[PDB]
């Protein structure tokens, strides 16, 4: 019934000591993406192949393999398969994969395809670095102060997608259990409440700090600073807060700075001393702006991350070029990070950063990182040629407008 | 026991059908608070004294009355009473109260004590409006384009301070129940796990959009956008997006525009159609940048609300003089809402313009209009003659640095 082909040339990437072993010739699955995916996911395969045919002359070469999920699913495997087992089977057999912008349909009660996607392959970490790009249009005065990595918690939080709806049975079950059982009276409203449930695990918390405490290590980065709103939700975000510094001190032989609260850790590998702090998030939310250059890796949860990932974006304007990454430790999936502008679909007008800045981060985590830099070298030559998309154009003077696919042989002649 | 002394020359203001009854000599309650209080209440109180005594020629006078709460209510009443009854009977009382920034222990198990009074007070709209005062150093090419007034949620979310730590005794209980009456089954991690419970009431949200539309209507004012991350919480965010879309269909005559989702009130009396519109959080995080201006007023729940003032208070470099109001059914509190900067405390050096800018909305909403555009008018004067406090100073070229106290008085000399 399967309608997916795997490649007969290409081979399937293993995990071994949790190493990934990359053949040189990768069988790598492929997610569309509705309505611009369709634009996108086109130059996000010739840059990619252009780069790693530059990089590595022919000796190594990506071997795509087409999944589903989306809108493409449905016309693909039948009505109301939006996602297929098989496709989660499938980026988890092959570790690793790369996907366009997708959506959730409303008024058949299904809950977020992106989310579903990571929650069930247990891609706990959202891995969002948030760079400027020399020549790219900006709202601010100086976004090149900001060069930070998101490190968003993935599998908790009010994100879980628990709640119920105003009314119904279970809601006042619930609430009943509230009031009654665990004596609550802070609702101010029980009536006619939906309730959501915003949970936050010690566990969850260590494997996303410990992940980002290993990131900056591995990249010589300044400071890791875990974002929260601790002040207020105590038992939940000031318990993130409270389990990240732990593991900083338990794993990583962090010591006190001053009379606390911030942490400095040793680079084993550089002798670099990494500041561990922390920031209230709505106060992280002006420091983006006002003291960019004051951060760097950031560890936050899951509805902060997007947040958070989402305003630094649009700060550097970055908000159509952001890359993003989904990384678990048996599978990891890429992502364009914007959404799938239906209007656009088919114009082939669309902005490519995303998915293709995707794409170079995918390649790095395939140690495959000549072709990675190829993919950065190129965006920012062309993004620096002012030779860009609409999006890009309607914001500057004298640039040279060029369409989706245009703007993909721009990255590629720029590498 | 009371230590608080009631002015001997002033009258309490009145409530009656909806109506404040202000008298020429109300009786304005004031808690100076911690850290930095001791310098901005004082600035405030003068320049207050000022705007009144010129926009009536002094046949109106407001009679200040100190009440406690925080760091100053323990020196003053004891030990351990960080917010007396007396207080919130006090407040109720008056009707019309301002303070000075407030904090909150940590190590006592005492929450918010901001969060105490408003949620005590029932003062469910948090009312913060963010403009740019030409001449203001911001990290922002065009915060002019930036004129919008916040109706945060006051009452519910996450906010609400219902949750239980990791390993107690209810934690476990609540997550019991969760898993095996509720079939809960989205817990990534059932151990060590917070809970939060993040509710959403039907009343809760109309009584705030009730507000903002309201306020709209008032102002003439463009616009009334619904902020929320339904498309995730839908039975609490959702929710509050669709019962403001009704709200606005029910009461105020909201008719379609184009196929939806759009409404639009006709402003009975100015005959303007107001459009009630909606974005996703994240995403208006990211248009607050880009696009500032198509924005006005903003009804959304108390985290988020939370999120968006600070965002837009950095923006338009208004971090330390964003006004703020806790407005309820019975009475309301206008403060500071900046931290209290306990380095600073004393030196008499930090910016007065959150504080005082409060207070031209406490004025305002006593009626004395007058007395509040004289404020705004000295504001804009002396920011604009780059006659400032450090924290602006500090990113200016050929500005006079001021203190606390000689910037309130530039306001004053500007009226
Ligand atoms: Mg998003
Ligand atoms: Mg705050």
Redesign the pocket.
């Known amino acids: 019934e399967s309608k997916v082909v795997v490649p007969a040339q290409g081979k399937k990437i293993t995990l071994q000591n949790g190493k990934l072993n990359v053949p040189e010739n990768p069988i790598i699955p492929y997610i569309e993406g509705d309505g611009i995916g369709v634009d996108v996911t086109p130059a996000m395969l010739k840059v990619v192949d252009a780069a790693v045919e530059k990089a590595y002359k022919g000796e190594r070469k990506i071997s795509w393999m087409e999944i589903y999920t989306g809108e493409k699913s449905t016309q693909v495997y039948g009505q109301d398969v939006w996602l297929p087992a098989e496709t989660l089977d499938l980026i988890r057999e092959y570790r690793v994969a790369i996907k366009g912008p997708l959506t959730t349909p409303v008024g058949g009660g299904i809950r977020s395809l992106?989310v579903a996607l990571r929650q069930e392959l247990d891609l706990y970490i959202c891995l969002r670095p948030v760079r400027y790009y020399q020549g790219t249009p900006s709202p601010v005065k100086h976004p090149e102060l900001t060069d930070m990595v998101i490190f968003r918690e993935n599998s908790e939080d009010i994100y879980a997608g628990i709640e119920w709806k105003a009314d119904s049975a279970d809601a006042e079950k619930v609430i009943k259990f509230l009031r009654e059982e665990m004596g609550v009276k802070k609702i101010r409203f029980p009536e006619h409440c939906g309730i959501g449930i915003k949970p936050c695990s010690e566990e969850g918390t260590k494997r996303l700090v410990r992940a980002a405490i290993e990131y900056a290590i591995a990249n010589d980065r300044d400071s890791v600073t875990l974002v929260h709103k601790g002040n207020i939700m105590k038992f939940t975000e000031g318990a993130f807060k409270d389990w990240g510094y732990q593991l900083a001190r338990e794993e990583f032989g962090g010591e006190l700075i001053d009379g606390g609260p911030w942490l400095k850790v040793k680079n084993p590998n550089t002798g670099k001393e990494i500041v561990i702090k922390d920031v209230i998030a709505d106060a992280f939310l002006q420091q983006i702006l006002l003291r960019p250059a004051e951060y760097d890796v950031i560890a936050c949860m899951n509805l902060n991350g997007?947040y958070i990932?989402?305003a630094l974006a649009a700060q550097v304007g970055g908000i159509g070029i952001a890359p993003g990454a989904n990384i678990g430790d048996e599978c990891a999936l890429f992502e364009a990070?914007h959404?799938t502008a239906p209007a656009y679909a088919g114009q082939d007008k669309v902005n490519p950063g995303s998915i293709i800045l995707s794409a170079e981060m995918m390649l790095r985590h395939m140690g495959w990182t000549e072709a990675a830099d190829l993919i950065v070298k190129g965006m920012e030559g062309a993004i620096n040629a002012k030779t860009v998309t609409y999006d890009f154009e309607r914001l500057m003077d004298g640039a040279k407008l060029l369409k989706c696919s245009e703007f993909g042989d721009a990255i590629i002649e720029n590498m």
């Open positions: 992106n997007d990932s989402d990070t959404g």
